[PDB]
């Protein structure tokens, strides 16, 4: 019956200027709702949502992925791995009602891109065309990675998403943003210092801080620094693996390079499983609130 193919289909009569206004709405709500999660803001959770709706992809049969917007259904919604993402969903809710024409998959992925850009991260090219798919196309729970693992697990897991060593190390840099919450994932604490500004501090912190592996209140083991940060076992394994370690040192010495590689990797992540036809518009780079004068 032939492999499952997802053809990008631009929302009828919508263009670059239309998506900028969705972007603006997301960015403005980011700017104004600054109290959430003890003044961390919605930035980090929007990025996590975008990665989680994308990280269900299986390259072998093109199941899961951002295309179908399948996060809107309870099976994927109540995924224990996705605990806490309801906040990001409720954030995007009023925006979806203001732009009812945009597909769920386009909105989720755009939220992540907006967040990264607004948090002074790199520019992330973005492509529209994702289309809402029925509820039985929803991926089973358990396709997202576990935290209590080593580098071997990480490398292997990301093969399924077609990500190589450099792409993995780059994407993990997103753990410069936000924190872990105990009632969500059984891990607690800020990853770094700048919680809502996109930097290369993930790499610098891994290499330069003094970490200790200890039990938290959920009896889960996590790496804690004396400076009060925390890292998951999967995060710390990036300096336990020799090949990972080289790339870690690279991004720690060059933020510009990290920004470039993250932008590629992230867009690749959001676009996995999508076939873009020839008539499809070129990828969009959206203007931040800052360069609009705000």
């Amino acid at each position: 019956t032939t492999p499952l193919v997802h053809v990008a289909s631009v929302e009828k009569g919508r263009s670059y200027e239309d998506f900028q206004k969705v972007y603006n709405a997301i960015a403005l709500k980011l700017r104004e709702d600054d109290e959430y999660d003890n003044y961390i803001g919605y930035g980090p959770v929007l990025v996590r949502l975008a990665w989680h709706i994308s990280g269900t992809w299986d390259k072998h049969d093109n199941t899961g992925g951002s295309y179908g917007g399948t996060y809107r259904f309870k099976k994927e919604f109540n995924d224990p791995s996705n605990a806490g993402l309801q906040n990001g969903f409720k954030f995007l809710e009023p925006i979806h009602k203001e732009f009812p024409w945009i597909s769920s998959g386009d909105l989720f992925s755009l939220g992540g891109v907006t967040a990264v850009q607004e948090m002074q991260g790199p520019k992330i090219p973005w492509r529209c065309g994702r289309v809402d798919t029925p509820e039985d196309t929803t991926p089973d729970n358990g396709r997202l990675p576990d935290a209590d693992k080593d580098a071997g697990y990480v490398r292997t897991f990301f093969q399924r998403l077609n990500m190589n060593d450099r792409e993995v190390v780059a994407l993990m840099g997103a753990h410069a943003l936000g924190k872990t919450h105990l009632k969500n994932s059984g891990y607690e604490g800020p990853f770094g210092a700048a919680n809502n500004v996109f930097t290369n501090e993930f790499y610098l912190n891994l290499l330069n801080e003094d970490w200790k592996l200890e039990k938290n209140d959920a009896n889960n083991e996590q790496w804690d620094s004396k400076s009060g940060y925390m890292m998951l076992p999967t995060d710390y394994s990036l300096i336990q693996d020799p090949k990972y370690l080289s790339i870690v040192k690279e991004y720690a010495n060059d933020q510009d390079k990290f920004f470039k590689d993250f932008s590629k990797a992230f867009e690749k992540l959001l676009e996995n499983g999508i076939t873009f036809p020839k008539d499809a518009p070129s990828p969009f780079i959206f203007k931040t609130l800052e360069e609009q004068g705000l």
Binding site: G41, A194, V197
Partner: protein, 103 residues
Amino acid sequence: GSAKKGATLFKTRCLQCHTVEKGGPHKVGPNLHGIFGRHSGQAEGYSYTDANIKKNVLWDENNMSEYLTNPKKYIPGTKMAFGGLKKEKDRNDLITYLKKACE
């Protein structure tokens, strides 16, 4: 402004990188004791970017407000990774608290 609200804003948005007490430890950024009425990039023991030193400004409540609105805008090349307080109310509250906290 409300010093107590400003206390909350400092605890959640500044404390991770700065302390306020006299003779308090340097962290991500420098200790901020006696910050008002002192030249920028002058905390002893701390390693600033030279962009912060080149700015060369005695810190007061007005330039603090502008700085904390958008740190990269006021001092290009600063390494203080902070988005910025975009609500003037919060800037007034924070600076009010910081005025006494670091006396």
